[PDB]
Structure 1
């Protein structure tokens, strides 16, 4: 699972890897070092290596000669089984058969790389819990590693002596890893996963359970500024934190069967970017829309794609069914000469029907970063189903990359939050962009984090990657790029200072 991804390898190194340890059908993915933000699919075929560009501009993974995907895991799963119709110019099939596995452990949640014996004990003593563990580089034995495991009962600081921390040396000799006896492993991940399944037992009988990695991402909101400083800059920083998050995407390959159904195929903007069955919005007014409920784990959201001409009516059905009263559009109808969303609302002062739904554009206000549209939504034949829907259209998202300052986003979401809150029993806030995962994901996560701070003040804990992972288990690929990942941190930092300045 995600071992075919090699986060710190060069193009030539990848070639040599595939040529020396691979066979025809072998492959790996890697970040493009030439095209930052983008990726490369390196495949061995007919005795040599081909490199295949995978572009990600913030909306999705665009495989050259292939299709658009929500995550690299989903792309690889796609080809490595059903509908592996990957080809090139000539029309030749390119087979993805043998994942060439990576041995670098940096993006393992339990691997902290560069860290000392004292700080390690600090983390394990405070955040630590029964079965919490971690692996750091040995400073006293270069090339070697230390595994540290907390066992006992309760968590956090204790003095009852009912808990303890054990340290196990991991020797690296001749490119393989062991704990001083027994099996030797080709990588630290193999070793760790072996001892998770077969726990080490001490003579006196303490079983060293490797239950959960220690959390090293959670911070107190007050000190986000300091955390950003360290992650910015050897010890792991932003890049490793993000790559560690990406690695966990392989836990999220849930079914999206309803999306793949023939009847619903043309209801998806992008054919392979689908909602999870278990969180999709079911329309019980067919029953299909490309949307998922996102629930923070009071205010919820619906992340959805931009409407197609044949899904406009379904979009409005969804809005009515869910009692949604606020809609956040983060896209222009067309960007870089590409359709991203059809106009699904009437011109100002006009009234339109969309199947059984009827919508009136009452009034448009404009601001710097956005236009607000007051819409009246009702069901035809029923002159009491009228509800006001507020459509916030954010227009200042740069066509390439992310905004240089988060202040417009923050002011926008602040305004969106007050609107939602003013309307008792309003359902989820609808958020959409092209595929409903890039910007949508970014806006939603930022909104989630700020709400924690708005309600609990400067003195609360936030965990960006964990919030993102929680959101990703509800819609595929939410938050697409490391760029957006940094932008989330910047936005929460910026919010904090504007809070304290007042």
Structure 2
């Protein structure tokens, strides 16, 4: 699970490892230095290394000469199972067999690295709990490492002597880590994994249990600008630490995989988790590529740009979920490729989509978006009428993110108040194209900002933790580091607008 990702590796280091440590079928994946936000899948095949291009323009991972995916870990899972499916130009089959593991601990949640022994014991005392651990570089003995563990009863600033922090020295020696005796490990990860399964036990009996890492991403909203500064030396280790937790998220997507449903997916392999998918109720198909997103009151439906065949389903869902606000974050066409089919009538025009009937009551033009007031009803029963407000965001660039977050903010702000003005309104429908990159970007910003707007500029927000929570509910939510950074930029910008 993700040991096959090497984050700080050159194309030439890539081939060396594959030729010197590898064998045919061995492979690794790595981030492109030439086209940032793009990646590369390297497979030792026939004594040689072939490299395979993967692009992410912020919507999905496009495997060059393959299919589109939501995450690298879904990508890899797919081809170590649907075999013979990965082929080069000329038909030959590319075999993904042996993950070539990376030994870089930097991306581990529990690895800090350069950190003082005193600054660490503060973190553990202050924010730590029983079984809270961390691994840092040794100042004392350079090149070696130190593992620190809190063990006790309660958490926080305690004086009852019921808790304590214990420090174990980890020696790097001939390129293998050990804790002074016993087995020598190939990586930091392997040592830590070992001692989580098999805790170290102090002579006098204390069990050095490795329960959770120490959170270092949660921050007080008020100080966001200082952390923005810290990370712009940070932002990269932070994004990548988050990216490695995507392997815990390989939940099932069987409904999406059914034959009857394959043409209801924009991208055949980008599918809604079974356990959070939207299930259509009232001889009828129950499938739509849409997930409920719940912060963890207000909730979201993260979905895709409609297809010609799924327009009627979109409206069934909207009616079923009592959604009264839709957020569209894509043009119908971008870069000449179609992104969403027009699921709404022209201004003043009444349309039927299956049993669902929709009137475009009024449009409204604004700098950054178009607002459409739609009246949805069910055919037959003239009492099912409800107003659905469609916020169409016009000004998101074809490539990358907006250079300034103000449009997005003024948009979500207005969306927020529409929702709030309607009692019992259902989840807020959000969609782009594949409904994962832009859609997740928007939803996450809206969540973080709903927290601030409530609790105030004096509260705790944790961006990576929040993004992780959202990804556990729909694959790949928030696609790029560009998008990540933008989320920071936009929350910051939202504080500085509040305190002014």
Following superposition, the deviation at residue 113 of structure 1 comes to: 1.2
Following superposition, the deviation at residue 79 of structure 1 comes to: 0.1
Aligned counterparts of 2:360 and 2:279: Cα–Cα separation in 1: 27
For residues 347-398 of structure 1, the C-alpha deviation after alignment (integer angstroms, 9 at most, x for no partner) is 0000000000000000000100000000000000010000000000001101
Aligned counterparts of 1:125 and 1:491: Cα–Cα separation in 2: 32
Following superposition, the deviation at residue 134 of structure 1 comes to: 0.1
For residues 231-253 of structure 1, the C-alpha deviation after alignment (integer angstroms, 9 at most, x for no partner) is 00xxx911000000000000000
Q: Do 1:111 and 1:134's aligned partners in 2 also have CA atoms closer than 8 Å?
A: yes
Long gaps (5+) in structure 1: none
Following superposition, the deviation at residue 84 of structure 1 comes to: 4.9
Aligned counterparts of 2:41 and 2:293: Cα–Cα separation in 1: 31
Following superposition, the deviation at residue 24 of structure 1 comes to: 0.5
Structure 1 residues 84, 70: CA separation in 2 closer, same or farther (over 3 Å shift)? farther
How many residues are aligned here?
Answer: 498
Note the aligned Cα RMSD (angstroms): 0.7
For residues 260-317 of structure 1, the C-alpha deviation after alignment (integer angstroms, 9 at most, x for no partner) is 0000000001000000000000000200000000000010000001000000000000
Q: Do 1:57 and 1:400's aligned partners in 2 also have CA atoms closer than 8 Å?
A: yes
Aligned counterparts of 1:273 and 1:71: Cα–Cα separation in 2: 9
For residues 157-206 of structure 1, the C-alpha deviation after alignment (integer angstroms, 9 at most, x for no partner) is 11001010000000000000000010000000000000000000111111
Q: Do 1:43 and 1:96's aligned partners in 2 also have CA atoms closer than 8 Å?
A: yes
**What pairs with 1:77-476 in structure 2 (closer than 5 Å)?**
77-232=77-232, 237-285=234-282, 286-476=285-475
Following superposition, the deviation at residue 83 of structure 1 comes to: 4.8
Aligned counterparts of 1:440 and 1:345: Cα–Cα separation in 2: 19
Following superposition, the deviation at residue 103 of structure 1 comes to: 0.3
Following superposition, the deviation at residue 82 of structure 1 comes to: 2.8
Structure 1 residues 486, 238: CA separation in 2 closer, same or farther (over 3 Å shift)? same
Aligned counterparts of 2:207 and 2:25: Cα–Cα separation in 1: 42
Following superposition, the deviation at residue 122 of structure 1 comes to: 1.2
Following superposition, the deviation at residue 2 of structure 1 comes to: 0.3
Long gaps (5+) in structure 2: none
4+ runs deviating over 6 angstroms: none
Q: Do 1:325 and 1:420's aligned partners in 2 also have CA atoms closer than 8 Å?
A: yes
**3-state SS, counterpart of residue 4 of structure 1:** coil
Aligned counterparts of 1:303 and 1:46: Cα–Cα separation in 2: 43
For residues 461-481 of structure 1, the C-alpha deviation after alignment (integer angstroms, 9 at most, x for no partner) is 000000000000000000000
Q: Do 1:131 and 1:208's aligned partners in 2 also have CA atoms closer than 8 Å?
A: yes
Aligned counterparts of 1:66 and 1:99: Cα–Cα separation in 2: 19
Q: Do 1:351 and 1:360's aligned partners in 2 also have CA atoms closer than 8 Å?
A: yes
Q: Do 1:348 and 1:362's aligned partners in 2 also have CA atoms closer than 8 Å?
A: yes
Q: Do 2:4 and 2:29's aligned partners in 1 also have CA atoms closer than 8 Å?
A: yes
Q: Do 1:40 and 1:54's aligned partners in 2 also have CA atoms closer than 8 Å?
A: yes
Aligned counterparts of 2:106 and 2:35: Cα–Cα separation in 1: 22
Aligned counterparts of 2:309 and 2:403: Cα–Cα separation in 1: 36
Aligned counterparts of 1:499 and 1:382: Cα–Cα separation in 2: 46
Aligned counterparts of 1:39 and 1:84: Cα–Cα separation in 2: 21
**3-state SS, counterpart of residue 29 of structure 1:** strand
Following superposition, the deviation at residue 152 of structure 1 comes to: 0.2
For residues 419-466 of structure 1, the C-alpha deviation after alignment (integer angstroms, 9 at most, x for no partner) is 000000000000001100000000000000000000000111000000
Q: Do 1:78 and 1:84's aligned partners in 2 also have CA atoms closer than 8 Å?
A: no
Following superposition, the deviation at residue 118 of structure 1 comes to: 1.1
Aligned counterparts of 2:84 and 2:336: Cα–Cα separation in 1: 29
TM-score by structure 2 length? 0.99
Structure 1 residues 377, 88: CA separation in 2 closer, same or farther (over 3 Å shift)? same
Following superposition, the deviation at residue 34 of structure 1 comes to: 1.1
Aligned counterparts of 1:97 and 1:207: Cα–Cα separation in 2: 38
Q: Do 2:83 and 2:95's aligned partners in 1 also have CA atoms closer than 8 Å?
A: no
